[PDB]
Design an enzyme around this catalytic site. Structure first.
Site, PDB file in Angstrom:
ATOM      1  N   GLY A  58      -4.964  -1.593 -38.456  1.00  0.00           N
ATOM      2  CA  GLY A  58      -5.076  -0.776 -37.593  1.00  0.00           C
ATOM      3  C   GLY A  58      -5.702   0.660 -37.966  1.00  0.00           C
ATOM      4  N   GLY A  59      -6.695   1.202 -38.441  1.00  0.00           N
ATOM      5  CA  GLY A  59      -6.770   2.638 -39.057  1.00  0.00           C
ATOM      6  C   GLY A  59      -5.992   3.421 -38.601  1.00  0.00           C
ATOM      7  CB  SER A 142      -7.461  -2.000 -41.205  1.00  0.00           C
ATOM      8  OG  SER A 142      -8.323  -1.532 -41.041  1.00  0.00           O
ATOM      9  CB  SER A 143      -5.294   1.941 -42.380  1.00  0.00           C
ATOM     10  OG  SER A 143      -4.764   1.146 -41.548  1.00  0.00           O
ATOM     11  CD  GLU A 241     -14.283  -6.159 -44.458  1.00  0.00           C
ATOM     12  OE1 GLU A 241     -14.028  -4.816 -44.510  1.00  0.00           O
ATOM     13  OE2 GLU A 241     -14.099  -6.500 -45.730  1.00  0.00           O
ATOM     14  CG  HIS A 272     -12.206  -5.269 -41.273  1.00  0.00           C
ATOM     15  ND1 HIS A 272     -10.894  -6.127 -42.380  1.00  0.00           N
ATOM     16  CD2 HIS A 272     -11.044  -4.160 -41.201  1.00  0.00           C
ATOM     17  CE1 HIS A 272     -10.054  -4.773 -42.605  1.00  0.00           C
ATOM     18  NE2 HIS A 272     -10.445  -3.518 -41.921  1.00  0.00           N
TER      19      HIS A 272
END
Lengths: 299, 306
Positions: A58-59, A142-143, A241, A272
């Site tokens: 979720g960045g 991700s994050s 990505e 991603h």
């Protein structure tokens, strides 16, 4: 006035209030890990059983352990790896800017240590096998990948009862002012260069740059990696990505730097989060296949 | 050490384990960063720029140990409130016992009010839902289900921590819906037939996990009437409305409550009983005659207090 608008679901105002908007195995329950900020994590135990800390993506601005495909993945690691999964929530930007998430990550580890020094009181599922895998392996989506890196770099004997063995880095959210080749050009389904920038703008401290540490591991302010000893890592990236070369350049540098054990795997033409999104696709089970090895060879 | 319905397990060592009516738009926001507490705002879509909308802070139930703004029937109720009352609804999460024992929830309640004042002053009004809407912060109304009712009793701005006269925002009335009150001496209802949901031992559980270790059911945070609780006669209170089901185990508690405030000087307290009804009949069984009635009294309660 909307100062920032992440896909409509997040609205950071000018003044700064911030607005917001398939089978079944394994068993799961939740618990607190940090009382002062009221942060909770979830435990998965495969039932088929005879630790894997999952930091969701979720960045740094979206995500929750309760979310569907986050949860769905957690059962899959748990079952197929025959594994206890620890899926914590971490504080989210822009309300809680970095290093909030990293501080919370360290808090997760501390909770595990404090549960381990509990004189092995299961305190999770008493009907259980003491430390199915005392060996712990961090996995970051991700994050979440960024956290895993910061957690390697930080723990270069702290929390001794618990020993990190490996680090899985799944499309890690890394930053920098210079785009490379993946960022420029084709926006993914859901992922666009401006969106990745947005994530950074909301995440990093006010005034900071994309080459700020906690975003770029090779920024000017970021530390030197050669001296620090790292644990063996595994980087997994989708071919399509925008962070393909970022993770290649990362892996490339670590492997060429000496001593660090870093493996890199690409899945051709995937975007991603092909893992924990479209699961049970061939690619997904392949990811399952590799992480298992990554851990049994790290046993 | 304690087991609430299977869904909550407080172990010996401090360790806690757990397990489309439309007409309104809604979205979430932070209100307290140090504790990472979020609330939800409901704003009617039926709004055709009618007038200045009132505010309805809804504190959810769960005996201080369960509940979330995101929960289904909590969310559903908030939607019905906003629509039927034509009002801005504020449904916050408050910290939960046993992890966060009282007065955690009350402190968090005060943080909601302070937040709304920071969203009354410093604009913010209508910047939430851009639909042109005026917000009458002068007309605020607290609504408390179960434990939420207890929250409503305290936080009566005077009965609260200093009353910080949060002008411009001004609470007018307090609706207390099956309020979760306590005390060592049981009264008829506690001693009779335990409900489908509520059981006497369960309410004791709720209290045990909620109040500070070693405290008693007559602690001021559970019992408003003694030993340690305030006089209430001295402090001036705002007009209130108590709603209870006939079959509730806290029927007499809230009646004894209403009786006592009403028997005091000046205080305006209305009491309504719904015959044979169980706790949270308004929430669990909406669109029922009883429920729709509940939204008609609160309406009048607001329009007489406007």
């Amino acid at each position: 006035q909307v100062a920032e608008d992440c896909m409509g679901l997040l609205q950071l105002l000018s003044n700064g209030t911030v607005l917001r908007s398939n089978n079944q195995t394994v068993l799961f329950k939740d618990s607190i890990y940090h009382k002062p900020n009221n942060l909770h994590l979830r435990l998965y135990k495969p039932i088929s059983a005879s630790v894997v800390v999952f930091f969701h993506g979720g960045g740094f601005c979206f995500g929750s352990r309760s979310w569907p495909h986050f949860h769905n993945f957690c059962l899959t690691l748990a079952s197929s790896l025959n594994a206890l999964v620890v899926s914590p929530d971490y504080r989210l930007a822009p309300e809680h800017r970095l290093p909030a998430a990293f501080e919370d990550a360290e808090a997760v580890l501390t909770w595990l240590w404090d549960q381990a020094v509990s004189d092995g009181v299961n305190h999770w599922f008493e009907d259980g096998t003491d430390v199915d895998f005392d060996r712990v392996f961090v996995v970051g989506d991700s994050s979440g990948g960024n956290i895993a890196h910061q957690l390697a770099v930080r723990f270069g004997i702290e929390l001794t009862p618990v020993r990190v063995r490996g680090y899985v880095l799944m499309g890690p959210f890394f930053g920098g002012e210079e785009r490379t080749n993946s960022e420029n050009g084709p926006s993914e389904a859901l992922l666009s260069l401006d969106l990745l920038d947005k994530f950074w703008r909301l995440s990093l401290p006010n005034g900071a740059t994309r080459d700020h540490h906690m975003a770029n591991p090779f920024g000017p302010t970021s530390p030197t990696l050669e001296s620090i000893s790292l644990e063996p890592m595994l980087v997994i990236v989708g071919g399509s990505e925008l962070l393909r070369d970022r993770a290649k350049e990362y892996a490339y540098k670590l492997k060429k730097m000496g001593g660090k054990r870093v493996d890199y795997i690409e899945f051709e033409n995937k975007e991603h989060g092909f893992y924990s999104n479209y699961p049970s696709s061939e690619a997904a089970e392949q990811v399952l296949r590799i992480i298992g090895d990554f851990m049994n060879n790290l046993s």
